[PDB]
Design a protein around this nucleic acid. Structure first.
Lengths: 185, 222, 51, 148, 49, 58, 159
RNA sequence: AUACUGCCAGCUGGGACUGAGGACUGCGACGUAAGUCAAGGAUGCUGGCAUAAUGGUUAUAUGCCGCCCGUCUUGAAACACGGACCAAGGAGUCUAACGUCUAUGCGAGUGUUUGGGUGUAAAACCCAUACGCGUAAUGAAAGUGAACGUAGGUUGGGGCCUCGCAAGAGGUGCACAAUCGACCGAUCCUGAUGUCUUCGGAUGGAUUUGAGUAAGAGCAUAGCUGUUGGGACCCGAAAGAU
RNA sequence: AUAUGUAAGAAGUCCUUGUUACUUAAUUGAACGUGGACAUUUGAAUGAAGAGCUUUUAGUGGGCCAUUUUUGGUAAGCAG
RNA sequence: CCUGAAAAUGGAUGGCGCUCAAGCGUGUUACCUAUACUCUACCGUCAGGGUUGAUAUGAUGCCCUGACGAGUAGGCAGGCG
């Protein structure tokens, strides 16, 4: 017998081998496992694990988010890299000439980028141009702003968006939610 | 890239140089070992000559071996056995003797036998059952390169360099001792010498501090 | 593939310890020492033999 | 599908995952929302504060069409102008030929000022407008004409 | 009856609802019958629109 | 029928399975619960430092 | 029935002291507490306002708030399987500065001072504390100290 | 110059179990120079037998061990309950509305399928209405409605932007967490120009409050799991009613 | 005695304020800061098996028995 | 050691039997054997890694290394029908 200090036969807890059955995603994985093993570039390691991520863990990146990213000083000519969808933002009126590498582009997002004179490349094209991830800037979308997460941690005095169908007066705005009816949370 | 003699010659020459200094260092350790034991003997003779009593230094190293199984152990000694890396019966580790570690030993006294190992048993422990913790893996020492690749930053280059850092508790004892995987000993070849293990050694049992008699117990377990 | 224990397999012993050659050749396991008659004091034997 | 469910995997195990001691009985705690004040209080109060009681005033014969007032924010205002002429309008930013943006025709009742339109003049026809949205529209050189 | 954090639902199925359930299986059938009725009706009023 | 009334038996063991971790500490604790007079003044002092710093590194 | 009021089982805990009743000596009101100071909690039974709960007797915390007569103390309390952050509004009579904290700050200055002296010459000052070490060898002289031989005594009544 | 103790990288024997593993490498040892070796795991030689001889199966005998399963239960072999035997049948389902997660498409949008058009006819294919959800919140409501800052400051922060040849920093930092702010609604205050003098409405605020803003993330389909109503995993009342 | 709180530092330490509407008689302080001085010892020991974090959901919510402490009871294979 | 010492079917230092014991107290050894310990093989699980090499070897392929394995209620996974 052994006095075990930790749980035995414990799986890693991180993803490898993305859950997706998409062959082209798997093709990108096999390319980036090779890069993450033979290159020593930290960029290739994070791209490899980012390709395993589930859809909610790959929030969309709007071209607004990229334009702000390219406004970092020294970052104007960097290759913007996003593992996921690049979406189009109609709240901006100017887009620079940048290069964006992404898994997916929406029709407006791709049209916005090419009209400004830049490129809309995939991650296999980025690897040819940047095997070590040279001059790249990885863009991640907002992950804690989706609708599901605002119900996480719901409890007394937490302010976390009850799970509710109908919204309005007489839908959970009473006893327990105001001091004029009992108590407040 | 013809590569028949040029590359292998340099590597063998580098290996030969590492052997010469390992040989030089092992000769120095033997001289230091022999000097210390004689000097203790000479001091005892001199104190006897001048009508006085020579009190030997308190032993600086203990080897502790867990002699109890893993069932029915109260939480505090169970935590101490884990921090001493004794998670199996007959598992043994070296412990640098200090008040911080001595109080640890008194807590786990009913579950272990320990004492003061000599150079002979440490050499035999490391040679026979010596495994290094490398990448969280238990790899047999079996080669000077394996210690030099993991403890060379502390100047420990050979198996004897590792043994030296254990027998004479050195500045890098903690790194050298933790590098060693907990020793996995057998049951004693001739038995425990007592009918019942789970009394103190003083009471005719087996657990607790047997000062020098750990050498006989360990050598028969190793 | 197979662990070989020194203190047996003298070849693996010499690989780990080049000094095993010299220790063996000079017989440092059985080494004599010089003698000098340093006599303990008479008080020391009286205390030991004290009833 | 049926073959991927745990009912298939529970075959041969006595209790079907429901336990031997506390079994799968019919309605051990009541039906539906029963006992919400009594033995389900610890759930209601934790997850659904405000559930019990009444809050405000009643409105008989409330017609939802009365309050139909979808909002258009100013950052979305230029999406009402069609795409082909949009590029022309920004680059030719000028009075006396400002595009007319019929907000009601698009399907919005009120115009809100979420801010940062370009300084291109625009004529904005609306039912209701916010103070800031009209302020920002003038600063771009344009105007808000109230449409009924 | 009431359990962990979920939206409170109102599923009105406490009457004998299972007797008054209509599946529109004849969606395709009704559409064909309607086009036929339009076809025959137009013929009977052959010049009329 | 009488049952068992109360025991803390097994409760310490349960609490140690994935247990007694200390609360995570942060730089910049929340200024809630501290004196409002200090809070109101702290807001003005922090504002001036940001303006003072911005002027220096213009 | 059972009784669990605020001050239940506080008979001896909140007892004043032997020959230490009455008014509190004023040095307790002269001590200054800043945010971040480590304080001990020993409830003074004479002062009934700003009193800690009996759970917090003997607990040591950190000051986070300083008010007219009191200090907010953060105390970690074990509730189930985790520690919860508790905030105590305690009057100054029920707290005192931790002495170990003040001792460590002196070590911080002593460590910096020792580093400054050694850095002038590089003598490996080794600021790090060490456990008590096993004794070194020593020689015990017998002159004037002849060993005195002892035996077990016989049993006797002494009644 | 010795029944004790310690050490020997001292010596000489006698037994047992094991032989895992490469189409080519390592670390070493041994002679002063063809190289050998017990050095990152068994080979050499010699027999007998190519068959039920070894072995698999099965029956018995022998040695030792072996209470009847399912169930409820702290506790069952129980002097607790069901079970004489066998075959076939026999018990977590489908739907409405949903939570988490995951996959897919499109993406500030999304959903063709009420319907229309077609059709090889319940398929498939097509459709430049509306409607649902999302894109705005907040208040009981009347109502009002989200950037004067590079969409802020601070801490951390992966990744990215030089190398100097063996201590080795700085710059940029969009996920995210902590925190101080700013904006919108509500509440409580100020109440300016102006004026059907009784309306109008802050730039000024407040240990107040919101399921908010602060360069959108959603919509749809499918799947497991979990929820509610349903006969609702299957069987089972004493009753009540027409 | 046993048990128990805290601390043993990089979010730490050493300058006439840099800010404030707080505070002080007062640049007095308080809080938070810019620049300066500190990687093999980063300020006890031992260990660390990867930290930290989130969502969701099952079963369970009859317990019982050693040693030691201990209550009621003469006691109990009793009750707590 | 004996008396004190009485219960109901026949009867239990486990049984036989044991009397300088095979009893009792103690000391010293030798010896026996667990699914425990040491070492080795094989299965699985988990972890950490290697591998874009020739006119043979899909890179969830091939391979290296270490540790670990009890399980009701229950969860999940890979499979069988």
């Amino acid at each position: 017998g052994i006095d075990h200090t930790s749980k035995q036969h414990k799986r890693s807890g991180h993803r490898t081998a993305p859950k997706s059955d998409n062959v082209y995603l798997k093709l990108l994985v096999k390319l980036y496992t090779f890069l993450a093993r033979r290159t020593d570039a930290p960029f290739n390691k994070v791209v490899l694990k980012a390709l395993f991520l589930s859809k909610i863990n790959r929030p969309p990146v709007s071209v607004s988010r990229i334009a702000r990213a390219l406004k970092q000083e020294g970052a104007a000519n960097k290759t913007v890299v996003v593992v996921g969808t690049v979406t189009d933002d109609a709240r901006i009126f100017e887009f620079p000439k940048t290069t964006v590498a992404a898994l997916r582009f929406t029709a407006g997002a791709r049209a916005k980028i090419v009209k400004a004179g830049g490129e809309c490349i995939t991650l296999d094209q980025l690897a040819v141009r940047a095997p070590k991830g040279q001059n790249t800037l990885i863009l991640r979308g907002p992950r804690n702003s989706r609708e599901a997460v605002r119900h996480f941690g719901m409890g007394p005095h937490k302010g976390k968006a009850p799970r509710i169908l109908s919204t309005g007066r007489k839908f959970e705005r009473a006893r327990g939610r105001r001091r004029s009816k009992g108590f407040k949370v | 890239a013809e590569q028949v003699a040029a590359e292998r010659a340099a590597r063998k020459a580098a290996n030969k140089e590492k052997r010469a200094i390992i040989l030089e260092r092992n000769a120095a350790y033997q001289k230091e070992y022999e000097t210390a034991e004689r000097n203790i003997i000479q001091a005892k003779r001199d104190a006897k000559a001048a009508g006085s009593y020579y009190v030997e230094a308190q032993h600086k190293l203990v080897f502790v071996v867990r002699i109890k199984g893993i069932n029915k152990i109260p939480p505090k000694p169970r935590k101490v056995l884990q921090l001493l890396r004794l998670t199996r019966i007959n598992s043994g580790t070296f412990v640098k003797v200090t008040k911080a570690t001595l109080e640890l030993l008194k807590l786990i006294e009913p579950y272990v036998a320990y004492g003061y190992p000599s150079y002979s048993t440490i050499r035999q422990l490391v040679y026979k059952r010596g495994f290094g913790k490398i990448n969280k893996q238990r790899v047999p020492l079996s080669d000077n390169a394996i210690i030099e690749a993991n403890l060379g930053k502390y100047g420990i280059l050979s198996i004897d360099d590792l043994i030296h850092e254990i027998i004479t508790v050195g500045p890098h004892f903690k790194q050298a001792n933790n590098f060693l995987w907990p020793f996995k000993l057998s049951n004693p070849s001739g038995g425990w010498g007592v009918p019942r293990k789970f009394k103190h050694f003083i009471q005719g049992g087996s657990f607790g501090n047997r000062e020098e008699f750990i050498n006989k117990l360990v050598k028969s377990m190793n | 593939v197979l662990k070989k224990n020194p203190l047996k397999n003298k070849q693996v012993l010499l690989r780990l310890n080049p000094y095993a050659k010299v220790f063996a050749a000079e017989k440092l396991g059985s080494k004599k020492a010089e003698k000098t008659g340093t006599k303990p004091a008479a008080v020391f034997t009286e205390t030991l033999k004290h009833d | 599908p049926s073959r991927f469910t745990k009912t298939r995997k529970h075959r041969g195990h006595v209790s079907a995952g429901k336990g031997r001691i506390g079994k799968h009985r019919k309605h051990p705690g009541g039906r539906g929302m029963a006992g919400g004040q009594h033995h389900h209080r610890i759930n209601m109060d934790k997850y659904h504060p405000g559930y019990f009681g009444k809050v405000g005033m009643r409105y008989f014969h409330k017609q939802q069409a009365h309050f139909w007032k979808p909002v258009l924010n100013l950052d979305k205002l230029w999406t009402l102008i069609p795409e082909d002429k949009r590029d022309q309008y920004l680059k030719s930013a000028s009075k006396e030929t400002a595009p007319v943006i019929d907000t009601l025709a698009a399907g919005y009742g009120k115009i809100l000022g979420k801010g940062r339109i370009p300084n291109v003049p625009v004529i904005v026809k609306a039912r209701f407008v916010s103070k800031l949205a009209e302020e920002k529209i003038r600063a771009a050189g344009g105007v808000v004409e109230l449409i009924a | 009856a009431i359990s962990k954090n979920l939206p409170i639902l109102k599923n009105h199925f406490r009457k004998h609802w299972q007797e008054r359930v209509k599946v529109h299986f004849d969606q395709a059938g009704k559409k064909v019958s309607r086009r036929n009725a339009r076809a025959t009706r137009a013929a009977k009023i052959a010049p009329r629109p | 029928a009488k049952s068992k009334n109360h025991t803390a038996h097994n409760q310490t063991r349960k609490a140690h399975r994935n247990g007694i971790k200390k609360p995570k500490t942060y730089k910049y604790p929340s200024l809630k619960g501290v004196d409002p007079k200090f809070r109101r003044n702290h807001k003005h002092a922090l504002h001036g430092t940001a303006k003072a710093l911005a002027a220096a590194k213009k | 029935g059972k009784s669990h009021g605020y001050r239940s089982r506080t008979r001896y805990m909140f007892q004043r002291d032997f020959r230490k009743h009455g008014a509190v000596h004023l040095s307790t009101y002269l001590k200054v507490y800043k945010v971040g100071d480590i304080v001990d909690i020993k409830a003074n039974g004479s002062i009934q306002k700003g009193m800690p709960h009996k759970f917090y007797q003997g607990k040591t915390g950190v000051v986070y708030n300083v008010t007219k007569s009191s200090v907010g103390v953060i105390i970690n309390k074990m509730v189930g399987n985790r520690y919860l952050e508790k905030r105590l509004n305690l009057r100054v009579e029920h707290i005192k500065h931790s002495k170990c904290r003040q001792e460590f700050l002196e070590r911080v200055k002593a460590n910096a001072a020792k580093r400054a002296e050694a850095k002038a010459q590089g003598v490996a000052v080794q600021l790090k504390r060490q456990p008590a070490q096993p004794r070194e060898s020593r020689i015990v002289s017998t002159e004037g100290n002849v060993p005195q031989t002892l035996a077990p005594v016989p049993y006797e009544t002494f009644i």
